[PDB]
Ligand SMILES: O[C@@H]1[C@@H](O)[C@H](O[C@@H]2CO[C@H](F)[C@H](O)[C@H]2O)OC[C@H]1O
């Protein structure tokens with residue numbers, strides 16, 4: 001009640017978002033009502049949860065999310081249309097189990113994008129059209145996927161054009177993680193630049209920001225923001241969390257974060273939101289991949305069965321030290 005509200009603190013800087021599902025909307029309803037003005041479906045707008053079999057569309061869970069957001073004057077980011085994960089096998093196969101042709105996959109891609117985007121047209125203001133197409137390792141530009149294998153390397157151009165046709169007023173995003181590591185940053189930059197140089201309707205870059213206490217550095221974050229902003233795209237931070245474990249740290253037995261973990265996380269969030277506020281002219285939305293530590297995908301990724309404490313509020317929905325530094329930049 002004396003607590004500052006995140007969306008109000010950052011009212012002149014960017015929207016503040018949370019990834020949700022119908023369960024967490026109930027479990028965290030007051031935090032969301034008190035703090036966010038944007039919502040993303042954590043899972044229920046992905047392909048497998050919208051069209052699990054060809055021509056079987058299951059919008060019920062996504063509808064509940066959109067209804068909640070609309071009834072509390074919250075924006076919605078749509079996540080996500082074309083991704084190498086969480087897409088059913090049927091999409092890439094024919095009746096006899098072999099891979100479809102380029103033309104057939106483009107038909108199915110267009111039908112899915114058209115049906116999904118048109119349903120929420122005028123309620124959802126932007127879409128992550130392509131998720132994580134850039135290779136996360138190695139020297140190649142693109143990660144392998146059945147989308148790319150079957151259609152070809154222009155599969156992303158087609159996806160953006162299909163979504164633009166379905167809702168030409170939506171902001172269309174390329175969304176990715178490890179977006180601040182320089183080698184991947186340059187691949188993402190080259191990819192988006194090349195699409196923009198062909199007049200493809202890509203309006204924004206989504207920086208997932210699945211970050212650790214140490215990585216990426218503040219200078220890497222600054223360099224990535226400027227690198228992407230130089231393309232003239234809008235920037236969203238789309239899945240922010242600050243993991244208590246580095247990538248090499250696969251420990252399972254930590255029952256609580258240490259005092260220094262909690263303090264460093266507070267400092268880290270303060271530094272991050274200071275940098276975001278500094279780039280308020282190009283960052284228009286900051287969405288956390290959750291909202292409080294009683295629900296985070298980092299409990300089971302990348303190590304199944306442990307516990308992480310990545311967000312501004314604790315499991316009892318109380319502000320953490322990170323909250324206070326974040327709102328005081
Ligand atoms: O499934 C994806 C996952 O592979 C990816 O991996 C890590 C995310 O957290 C940091 F960014 C790590 O350094 C990455 O290697 O995160 C996105 C998720 O959708």
Ligand SMILES: O[C@@H]1[C@@H](O)[C@H](O[C@@H]2CO[C@H](F)[C@H](O)[C@H]2O)OC[C@H]1O
Pocket residue numbers: 042043131177208210238239289297
């Ligand atoms: O519940 C998990 C979900 O949170 C996860 O979401 C991805 C997290 O990494 C990025 F933000 C991706 O773009 C998200 O879609 O996906 C796996 C699921 O089990």
